[PDB]
Design a protein around this ligand. Structure first.
Ligand SMILES: CCCc1c(OCCCn2ccc3cc(OCC(=O)O)ccc32)ccc2cc(C(=O)c3ccccc3)ccc12
Ligand SMILES: CCCc1c(OCCCn2ccc3cc(OCC(=O)O)ccc32)ccc2cc(C(=O)c3ccccc3)ccc12
Lengths: 253, 261, 253, 261
């Protein structure tokens, strides 16, 4: 019934709030400006990065490489918030432990880029739990292999954010992504699709009720999931370029 | 022979009274107020449920009631196992078959004896200290609502048979000694014991209920109502696995449900 | 009167015969040898145990632990024969149901060791309804905690068997043990002692008539009841050692 | 609070099962034959060692066994690092402190979990495919003989505590989050996490082992047995440097031992 789908949406929203402290609502307030009690420091070039560097990884390498490696560090931090959120998705913890691992392994990147768009506008991205803001232009200016890393993320985010989803929408969308029955090496696919069908029903009703004037938003959101998959494949592609072409190494395992 | 069969009937009734504190006789006294010691607190909605739980002085509700169910089921399994040990010939069987008979028989017996605690309006809970209404249980959010109603439907029809504890003692033994359980290694010795129990049950019913036409057959037909209840229950368990978060049962209940039909 | 005490002794003897198929008389014939139509297989070591193992619980554990657990299994089988015998003791079934349970709970172990002595000689014990014979030496050779388990049973049995009691004596002695008014948590002690007094009278006359040359056998037999209680307490003691000190578990409830 | 502490205990047990294929439960099944799939090949002398190594069909021995030790240690470090990442709050720490916690904690955890694979007679080797006897290990030429015996002495006493995998999951996290490691930059945030883990461990032990008096304290006392094992081991490493020819470890193991206590 409709009530049960709404209860599931609410349960997911409350868990999401518990697992992810920097929510889209909080982040949008910062990107604009409501009661500026603590306006974030803006990193717009090499010198402003230094300015903030010894304001709050530390210095002793190519800035380009410290920024790229900082991306790695934060992304592993994020995996842990996502893993905990996943446990709250009804039916996830009762899946084969091995399939849980696989679901997380191949879903975490798509989720990071989804939630990263909450922290972005067309001109830059919130960093350090929202205390900083790094410009898209500065990131774009970094050394050749590295100057192209965030751009596809920004491009996705501008198009994704024009959908105007809120946290209650995103909570369900994220759960839908995790419960993807098409991940490599899953053992028991049917149970996963069974849960995803329930989550898709809940997502569909959520968007129809929250965005009644946005025609076919549900289909449009599903379409963004090929966008996300492509972004990940490029990012993974890009990580090969690096792995082979650098004197630099010291990655988060 | 007749005196053997009555001695067997009496032995079972004896062990039953020894193994199961809340008998049918005792439940009926309570349900009917023939007792004048402690009338049960009735739970019919969320407000009375809160009061009922907090009456301890002198997660969610649907998963919370499921959890009590689990605890009580474990307690029931312990009682039924003690009863089973007393059935002549049971402990002499292959140990793996004893396990197999308990694994498949325990839930059939749980629903049989639950009927003793039910009327068409509700079920006795907390060693008969509370009464939870059928309508309240029916109300519970989707899947959890579907757990108890089939039991009520069975119980009202089963209770119309008017069996008493002495009848039930032999019927429960019949259920345990079922030679058709999956994975049984030595079927005939079980069937031979069941034959003797069936003989004793038939005699017990003809003597205790002489005016009840074909009661023996009618009771054996309930064994198909029972087997249906259990497969429905196991199905519902798979629904709870998909729609609920952290569940995981007691080690005893997990073993019983492990690779069950 | 004397006749009534003899009638009670006979009633108990007939019930005993009905409840316990392997009687002392049958077992003594086997431990010696009268018309050897089916001489029992002797288990005198690890390899002879295997020999018989796949001759007739099954193999997949420390032999020591399978033997000890076999002891548990058989002892629960024996409780059921004892429970049925108890019903035939005049007045037992009319006692409070709860007291019946308690009498059996705390009496069953003493009875098992009493009747076990019928199946023993100084060198070993009949097993598998008399089809096998396990040596005392082999049992003694088992792993440290377990090699000490049966010895006290053998020690008791050698001294007990020197009393030369027969089944008709034992039937009454067993009934005397069950009707012990000193068991913990009995509700109505007087009715139990009333019945035990009757059984003691019958036992005393039985021994005076059956063993007239055995001076004070009655007193001597009563004295064995502290021996039995001590054996049980040690065995229970020993079960604590195990319960705490083993990777092994899977006991008869 | 209580439900938080049980949720933490459950999360750790979950990650532990995910990060460590050969658990205690699985080692005990093997050591005890409760499994009926593949009984381990026992190595007790040089002749059985040869046969054991050449059973791959379906330098010197003392340095050769040391080398397997090294390979397995590296594999263990990878598993423990994956486990550590899952401990709530760990990846949020200063990266240099994360490294420092792994560097000093890894060997304490290796010997803790090795105990799971040991009885008083020997140790499971090759993902539980082999069993190498304590006496054989004790036999090894001077210095190499001295490596394994202290581990056995610890394991038998540790194993008497009867911890299970769910207990061990939280104890290993306690070990990792030790605020007293040399060179830690931010001690308090580590100590705060360890406080919470200690709370969860205490509750887990009281619930899982209610009859085990002062088990929590007894377990924490093992942390001093463990720290002693590691300093002894590092000492022994310096002996191997003087009495052996070309050794040199894996890059991962060299980093861990680099300027270690
Ligand atoms: C055999 C369970 C009997 C039963 C009960 O029977 C309703 C019929 C539905 N039903 C029968 C068996 C059974 C098993 C079940 O799951 C068992 C399992 O998962 O192991 C779910 C529902 C169920 C309703 C409420 C109870 C409520 C309680 C409680 O003590 C209780 C505990 C906490 C809070 C409120 C109430 C115990 C038993 C109940
Ligand atoms: C954590 C090591 C566990 C372990 C083992 O434990 C015995 C306790 C002694 N011990 C514990 C840790 C440790 C580390 C050590 O050096 C480690 C290092 O230098 O990095 C030497 C001995 C040692 C014995 C034999 C093994 C043998 C093997 C092998 O797979 C093997 C490989 C090649 C040939 C034979 C066997 C793996 C692990 C063993």
């Amino acid at each position: 019934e409709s009530a049960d789908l709404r209860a599931l949406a609410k349960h997911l929203y409350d868990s999401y709030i518990k697992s992810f402290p920097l929510t889209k609502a909080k982040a949008r307030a910062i990107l604009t400006g409501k009661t500026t009690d603590k306006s974030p420091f803006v990193i717009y070039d090499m010198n402003s990065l230094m300015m903030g560097e010894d304001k709050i990884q530390e210095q002793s390498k190519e800035v380009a490489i410290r920024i790229f490696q900082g991306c790695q560090f934060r992304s592993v931090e994020a995996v842990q918030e996502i893993t905990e959120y996943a446990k709250s998705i009804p039916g996830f913890v009762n899946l084969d432990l091995n399939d849980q691992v696989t679901l997380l392994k191949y879903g975490v990147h798509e989720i990071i880029y989804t939630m990263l768009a909450s922290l972005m506008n067309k001109d830059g991205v919130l960093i350090s739990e929202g205390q900083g803001f790094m410009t898209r232009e500065f990131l774009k200016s970094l050394r050749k292999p590295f100057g192209d890393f965030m751009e596809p993320k920004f491009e996705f985010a501008v198009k994704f954010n024009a959908l105007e989803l809120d946290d209650s929408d995103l909570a369900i969308f994220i759960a839908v992504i995790i419960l993807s029955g098409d991940r490599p090496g899953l053992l028991n696919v049917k149970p996963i699709e069974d849960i995803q069908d329930n989550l898709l029903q809940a997502l569909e009703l959520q968007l129809k009720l929250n965005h009644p004037e946005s025609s076919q938003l549900f289909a449009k959101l599903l379409q963004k999931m090929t966008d996300l998959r492509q972004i990940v494949t490029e990012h993974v592609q890009l990580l090969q370029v690096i792995k082979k072409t650098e004197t630099d190494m010291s990655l988060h395992p």
